[PDB]
Amino acid sequence: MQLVLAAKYIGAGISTIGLLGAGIGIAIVFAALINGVSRNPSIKDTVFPMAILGFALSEATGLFCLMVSFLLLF
Amino acid sequence: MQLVLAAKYIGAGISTIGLLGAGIGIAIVFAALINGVSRNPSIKDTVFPMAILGFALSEATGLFCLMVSFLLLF
Amino acid sequence: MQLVLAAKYIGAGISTIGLLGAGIGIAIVFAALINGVSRNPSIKDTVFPMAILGFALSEATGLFCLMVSFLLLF
Amino acid sequence: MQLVLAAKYIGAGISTIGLLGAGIGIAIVFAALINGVSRNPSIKDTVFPMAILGFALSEATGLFCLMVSFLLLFG
Amino acid sequence: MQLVLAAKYIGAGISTIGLLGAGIGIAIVFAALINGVSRNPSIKDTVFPMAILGFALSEATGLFCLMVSFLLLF
Amino acid sequence: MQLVLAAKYIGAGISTIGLLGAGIGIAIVFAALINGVSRNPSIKDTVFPMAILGFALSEATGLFCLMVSFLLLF
Amino acid sequence: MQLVLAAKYIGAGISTIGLLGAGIGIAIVFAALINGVSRNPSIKDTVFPMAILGFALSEATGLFCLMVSFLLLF
Amino acid sequence: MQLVLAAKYIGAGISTIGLLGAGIGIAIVFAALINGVSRNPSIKDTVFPMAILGFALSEATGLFCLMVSFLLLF
Amino acid sequence: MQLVLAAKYIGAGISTIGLLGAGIGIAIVFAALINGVSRNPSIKDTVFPMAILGFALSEATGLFCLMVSFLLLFG
Amino acid sequence: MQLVLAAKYIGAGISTIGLLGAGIGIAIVFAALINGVSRNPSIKDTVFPMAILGFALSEATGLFCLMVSFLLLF
Amino acid sequence: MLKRFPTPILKVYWPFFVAGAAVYYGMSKAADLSSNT
Amino acid sequence: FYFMNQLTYGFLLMITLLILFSQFFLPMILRLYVSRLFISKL
Amino acid sequence: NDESILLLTFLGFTGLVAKYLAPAYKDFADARMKKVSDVLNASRNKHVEAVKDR
Amino acid sequence: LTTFSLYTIIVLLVITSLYTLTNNNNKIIGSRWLISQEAIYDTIMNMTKGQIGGKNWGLYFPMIFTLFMFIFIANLISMIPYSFALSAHLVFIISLSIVIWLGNTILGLYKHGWVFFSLFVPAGTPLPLVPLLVIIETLSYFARAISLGLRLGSNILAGHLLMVILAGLTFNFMLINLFTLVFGFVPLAMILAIMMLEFAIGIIQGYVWAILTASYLKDAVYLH
Amino acid sequence: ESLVSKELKDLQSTLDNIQSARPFDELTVDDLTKIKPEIDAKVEEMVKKGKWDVPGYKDRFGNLNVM
Amino acid sequence: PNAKRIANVVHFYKSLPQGPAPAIKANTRLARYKAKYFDGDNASGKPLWHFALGIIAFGYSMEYYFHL
Numbered sequence A, B, C, E, F, G, H, J: 001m002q003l004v005l006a007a008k009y010i011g012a013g014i015s016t017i018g019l020l021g022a023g024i025g026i027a028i029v030f031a032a033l034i035n036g037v038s039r040n041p042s043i044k045d046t047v048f049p050m051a052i053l054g055f056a057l058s059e060a061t062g063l064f065c066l067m068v069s070f071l072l073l074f
Numbered sequence D, I: 001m002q003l004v005l006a007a008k009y010i011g012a013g014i015s016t017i018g019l020l021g022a023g024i025g026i027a028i029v030f031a032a033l034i035n036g037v038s039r040n041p042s043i044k045d046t047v048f049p050m051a052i053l054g055f056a057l058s059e060a061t062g063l064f065c066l067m068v069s070f071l072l073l074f075g
Numbered sequence K: 001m002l003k004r005f006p007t008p009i010l011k012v013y014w015p016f017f018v019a020g021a022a023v024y025y026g027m028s029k030a031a032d033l034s035s036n037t
Numbered sequence L: 001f002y003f004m005n006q007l008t009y010g011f012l013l014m015i016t017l018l019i020l021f022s023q024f025f026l027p028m029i030l031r032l033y034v035s036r037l038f039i040s041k042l
Numbered sequence M: 001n002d003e004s005i006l007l008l009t010f011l012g013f014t015g016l017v018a019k020y021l022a023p024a025y026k027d028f029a030d031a032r033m034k035k036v037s038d039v040l041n042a043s044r045n046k047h048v049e050a051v052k053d054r
Numbered sequence N: 001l002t003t004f005s006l007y008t009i010i011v012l013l014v015i016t017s018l019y020t021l022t023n024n025n026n027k028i029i030g031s032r033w034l035i036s037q038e039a040i041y042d043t044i045m046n047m048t049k050g051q052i053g054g055k056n057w058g059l060y061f062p063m064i065f066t067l068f069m070f071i072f073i074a075n076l077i078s079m080i081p082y083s084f085a086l087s088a089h090l091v092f093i094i095s096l097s098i099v100i101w102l103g104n105t106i107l108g109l110y111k112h113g114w115v116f117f118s119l120f121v122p123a124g125t126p127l128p129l130v131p132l133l134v135i136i137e138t139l140s141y142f143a144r145a146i147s148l149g150l151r152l153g154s155n156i157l158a159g160h161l162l163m164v165i166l167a168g169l170t171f172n173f174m175l176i177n178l179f180t181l182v183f184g185f186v187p188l189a190m191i192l193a194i195m196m197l198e199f200a201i202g203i204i205q206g207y208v209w210a211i212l213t214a215s216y217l218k219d220a221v222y223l224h
Numbered sequence O: 001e002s003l004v005s006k007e008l009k010d011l012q013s014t015l016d017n018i019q020s021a022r023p024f025d026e027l028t029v030d031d032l033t034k035i036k037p038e039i040d041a042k043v044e045e046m047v048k049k050g051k052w053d054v055p056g057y058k059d060r061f062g063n064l065n066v067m
Numbered sequence P: 001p002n003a004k005r006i007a008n009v010v011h012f013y014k015s016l017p018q019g020p021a022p023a024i025k026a027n028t029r030l031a032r033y034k035a036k037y038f039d040g041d042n043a044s045g046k047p048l049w050h051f052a053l054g055i056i057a058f059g060y061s062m063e064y065y066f067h068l
């Protein structure tokens, strides 16, 4: 009936607030990068790649969240 | 169909608070920034160009839930 | 008909707790500002905008949720 | 219409606990202020205005919550 | 017609955890109040008035919620 | 009118989760107390009263939220 | 009338996660206790009774929560 | 009759994630353990019994949580 | 009777997010491990067992949560 | 028949947000890694493998959550 | 009054004006195609 | 209704302010800067 | 009227402004004015001194 | 004639009223009214100097000024109660943001051609995730566009409407029995604090606009 | 011998003119442009190249900015 | 040395005595406004407030022309 499409919409709604954790995590990654480079700048060139390493595949698990909404949206 | 629009409205409602990390995450970045430049002053123009980049990458993923809420309202 | 407006109202209710993000975020920004000016009295200028700058970035995110509530309230 | 006011009331209910943000936030602001004034004796009069600055426009967000819980409750 | 008072009661129930903030918040204050004297046993009667003032106008935030709960029970 | 007391019960259910804030805060109080007394063992009769009083005063977070249920239970 | 008992059951279901903070709070207490005893190894017998005192009443929040869950289950 | 068992099942569902709390809390114990011996090597005999004591009687909380969930299931 | 299976399904859904606890917990354990091994390079084999110890019977508890969901999907 | 698949969809929705723990922790790991390697550069070869260890066996657990969603979506 | 100085506003900011015209044309399409709602 | 109205008058004012500022109001204060520094250096 | 309360808030705000910010901004502008004028006069004074020393 | 067009004329007249009548017949002394624009000029100058830091950095210094003043003035005129919001229109602000973004893209394409897309590879990354990191920024590059304006508008729209809604609060608070006249002052001071935060959400948000677009011009002109 | 007798009275007349012709608290940049086209030329070159940063200014004249 | 001398002998000779800048009857039914509120002597912010009242009137009149 009309219960399927309504539940699909509210499910796409609920299945999107999981990016909270990815956002907080990449934020603390940048925070640790800042707290580390300000203590020793001459290591940035070494830690900045790894940092943006630790960034990417820490958001990727969060990137699935809205994706799960997308396939549930349509 | 006077039922599915109410459901998509409340779905935009639940998918509105997904910016919670956008309210927190970016800030703690600046937190370390304040803990970064106040410790060592002469790294300001070195940590700020990447601090704003971290802010951009933080509000990027901290906003897709909000645009999901927009497109689920309509 | 008499169901969609109640749902819009409860959606404005559920989307209200999105301002939790700003309340958690801007706080640690001012906290780091106080901590940085405490251990370094003569750097506050260098860090006075950069703190409140981040304020206007986190506060605004809070200012998102409720306005999405407002356009959902009316 | 005899049903919408119940939803208004429960919406004011769910739109009231949002001051969790203010309750945690102003508290941690005062905590950092305590730490600062402790580790620096001669900075109080310099930080306390700014700190209370970082109170006022740091709590209005929470205010928003209950003013929602004031308009969906009564109006 | 029997739905409105049950809704009022569950609304008083759902709005109980707002002072949740205070439940943690004020405590954090005393946390610093302990850390403000461990590394500085001298300054006690100067930080204590500030700490109790912060406690007061932070608990106020906790309340602004349970008085809503009270006036919604009625 | 059998729905009203069932609603009272189910609303009192999530009124007892207000001690979450207590359960965290009145524990971080003793955490800070331990972390402070280990740094200076000689200051014990001075901060323990202080440490507690805050525990008492700050407590009740869950206790004033659990009263709702009881009041809401009866 | 066949709903009041199921409602009591499900309300006991949403009265269980209130010990949530307990499961964290008291735990981190021992964490600080470690940080209390591993930092200054001459404080164990001094603050271990203080530690168990801070544990008991603080867990008492989880005690209250799950016993309210029991009394709502019956 | 056909609804009370579904309510029991969803109540066992909503009373399950309370072990969330312990699921985090116990871990920080080991954290302090790693932060207790890394800067003080010969301290295991003093901290490890205390650490496992805290671990056990804090995980008891999540244990009671999921056994409440199980007894509400059946 | 047609509602009970959907109820079990949404119960398996709600009881699935409990591994949040393990995900945060084992992570703080490994974070403290990295902080300790980087602060004292001569402690690795001294702390590595306990650390991974602190892993297993932490996350296993979180595992228990979703295995409830398992026995709530069919049983 | 039309009631159960929509409930399965919303169950996938509610279960999707379990990657919160991944998004937080698989990034706190790299945060602590950066904080450790910045204050001591030459320990990367000692930590970086073990460090990335602490990533995998964590994030995979979070993965389990959303794959449950798949077996609840289909 | 105010002495005019020949400051470069065209030989510096040409892509910005180009993008402004492009957005004007896009909004022309948008409000000439979606104005029937 | 007034998308064209707002957008067109706004772009008119944008180009107006760009030309106006860049040609009159930044250099009129740069003149004060140069005069002060030229009287100082001499 | 409803919005008249907002006009009263604006009146009270501008009263607080004319009470607090106006004299502080006046003092700041006067301090900068005196500094700039004093340095501008000292430049010409040193120029005249160097011209007389030649 | 439109209220919005007349508001644009108001903005232009106020901008003229900040320099023309300000200048006391071209005096070096720099009178008080000139010190405000002096401070604005200096705080934008020392900002964009350290932001982009290029050997030829002042060439784009005009726009970073005119994008600020417009936002600094159009968000201080509507502060008057009996007026209408100028910048709360999401359409126009988002359109301005899209104009600036597309202009930056065209500038970068005309200046660097193919290599302009080297911004999407920040630093050293392992091979199996080289495109992945590009992805998020791939979509993030244009989310940068829509958000840049959407923030300020969603602030302004949330601001003025706020000052309206709670206004009715104090209107609906003083039409019930006259006993409400006692201790009915803290909502008045609350609206006062709302206007206090309003002025911030205007000025500091204009600053935010300036600093973000300065960083974006830096990214669009230079390749890291 | 006459060169010094001319150059001394030249600086003497300069000092006698500068003693009574210093309206520094009310001087106008229009007069400076009328006496010195170098001001306008330097402004024009500075704008054409874009050297909005004026060196040697911040040291004796504070930037007076918010930050 | 010689440079400062040849510079300040040229910078000084055309400079006007002191003060003297009344510009006769400086007025044009708007210019007076500048002499009263916008000189280095008064420099008071009142006009801003005055201008505020303008909008406080203008929109109100517009109110008086739209809603009431």
Ligand SMILES: CC[C@H]1/C=C/C=C/C[C@@H](C)[C@H](O)[C@@](C)(O)C(=O)[C@@H](C)[C@H](O)[C@@H](C)C(=O)[C@@H](C)[C@H](O)[C@@H](C)/C=C\C(=O)O[C@@H]2[C@H](C)[C@H](CC1)O[C@]1(CC[C@H](C)[C@H](C[C@@H](C)O)O1)[C@H]2C
Residues within 6 Å of the ligand: F052, F056, F057, F059, F060, F062, F063, G056, G057, G058, G060, G061, G064
């Ligand atoms: C009245 C508000 C709170 C504080 C006010 C004043 C009390 C002083 C404070 C320092 C403590 O109570 C105390 C140390 O003085 C105290 O309790 C002593 C008298 C006592 O001898 C102490 C050594 C204990 O051992 C005492 C903590 C208990 O024996 C211990 C087994 C656990 C705690 C406990 O059950 O007490 C709680 C607590 C006081 C809590 C908190 C009391 O109160 C009780 C009774 C009221 C309700 C039932 C609460 C429930 C709680 C979970 O919210 O539990 C009350 C039952």
Ligand SMILES: CC[C@H]1/C=C\C=C/C[C@@H](C)[C@H](O)[C@@](C)(O)C(=O)[C@@H](C)[C@H](O)[C@@H](C)C(=O)[C@@H](C)[C@H](O)[C@@H](C)/C=C/C(=O)O[C@@H]2[C@H](C)[C@H](CC1)O[C@]1(CC[C@H](C)[C@H](C[C@@H](C)O)O1)[C@H]2C
Residues within 6 Å of the ligand: E056, E059, E062, E063, E066, E067, F053, F056, F057, F058, F059, F060, F064
């Ligand atoms: C009401 C305005 C606030 C005023 C100023 C702040 C501090 C109070 C201060 C002057 C007191 O004297 C005190 C804090 O120092 C105090 O209580 C000590 C003197 C006293 O000796 C102390 C050790 C206690 O015994 C005291 C903690 C009581 O035993 C305990 C049962 C109090 C309960 C409590 O949580 O207090 C709050 C608090 C005062 C708060 C804060 C009080 O007030 C109460 C009552 C009003 C509402 C209900 C609030 C918030 C929430 C309970 O809704 O809780 C009130 C319930």
Ligand SMILES: CC[C@H]1/C=C\C=C/C[C@@H](C)[C@H](O)[C@@](C)(O)C(=O)[C@@H](C)[C@H](O)[C@@H](C)C(=O)[C@@H](C)[C@H](O)[C@@H](C)/C=C\C(=O)O[C@@H]2[C@H](C)[C@H](CC1)O[C@]1(CC[C@H](C)[C@H](C[C@@H](C)O)O1)[C@H]2C
Residues within 6 Å of the ligand: G052, G056, G057, G059, G060, G062, G063, G066, H053, H056, H057, H060, H061, H064
């Ligand atoms: C006031 C609260 C607690 C009382 C006393 C606390 C402090 C005094 C102190 C000296 C205690 O004796 C203690 C800390 O040593 C203590 O907890 C012991 C009894 C405990 O057995 C401990 C020494 C252990 O053996 C420990 C290593 C075990 O692994 C642990 C799982 C023990 C059992 C346990 O947690 O059961 C609980 C607990 C005792 C708890 C603890 C009760 O009690 C039980 C009783 C039944 C109900 C279900 C409660 C609820 C639970 C949430 O507290 O749990 C009870 C069911």
Ligand SMILES: CC[C@H]1/C=C\C=C/C[C@@H](C)[C@H](O)[C@@](C)(O)C(=O)[C@@H](C)[C@H](O)[C@@H](C)C(=O)[C@@H](C)[C@H](O)[C@@H](C)/C=C\C(=O)O[C@@H]2[C@H](C)[C@H](CC1)O[C@]1(CC[C@H](C)[C@H](C[C@@H](C)O)O1)[C@H]2C
Residues within 6 Å of the ligand: H056, H059, H060, H062, H063, H066, I053, I056, I057, I060, I061, I064
């Ligand atoms: C009082 C609570 C705990 C009791 C004792 C705690 C402290 C004493 C201490 C000496 C224990 O023996 C212990 C810490 O060594 C311990 O946990 C061992 C039994 C444990 O096997 C440990 C040594 C390991 O082998 C460990 C490396 C494994 O990876 C771990 C996954 C072991 C199994 C496990 O977690 O199962 C649990 C656990 C034992 C837990 C632990 C129970 O028990 C089981 C029993 C069945 C139910 C389902 C409970 C619920 C769960 C939430 O505790 O889980 C039980 C199902």
